[PDB]
Amino acid sequence: TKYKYTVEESERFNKHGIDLTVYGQVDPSATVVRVSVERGHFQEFFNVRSSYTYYVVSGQGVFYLNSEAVPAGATDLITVPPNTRIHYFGSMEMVLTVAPAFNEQDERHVRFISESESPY
């Protein structure tokens, strides 16, 4: 059994202004990924099946959850139910849990967000 996954062996890419680290573990109950963000996630989306739970390792930002501003800082936990519109601005390092496991078929695009809208 493979228990340990490393950053060296992960898939690392930029998506809508964030840097994602996808470790490549397979577990139907949850997908855990790393997110690094310099200014924002410049796209609003929702997921019809999975909750999105962000742990803020470091930094400061603001989530927009169904257009409601939710400030976030280091050590905060942001828990987003399924079918909730999400975007965010900030300079932050985060651990993101998607539960149950992320499936691209469950994701929906709402709108792009102008890069000038981030105060970071």
Residue numbers in the entry: 2 to 121
Paper excerpt:
Solution of the structure required the preparation of the seleno‐methionine derivative (SeMet‐Pac13) and demonstrated that the enzyme was indeed a cupin.
In pacidamycin 3, biosynthesis the 3′‐deoxy moiety is mediated by Pac13, an enzyme found to catalyze the key dehydration of uridine‐5′‐aldehyde 1 to form 3′‐deoxy‐3′,4′‐didehydrouridine‐5′‐aldehyde 2. In stark contrast to most characterised dehydratases, Pac13 is small (121 aa), monomeric, co‐factor independent and utilises a non‐activated nucleoside, rather than a free monosaccharide, as a substrate. Pac13 is the only monomeric, metal‐free cupin dehydratase characterised to date. We demonstrate here that the reaction most likely proceeds via an E1Cb mechanism, with H42 acting as an active site base, however, unlike many other dehydratases, no metal or cofactor is required for activity.
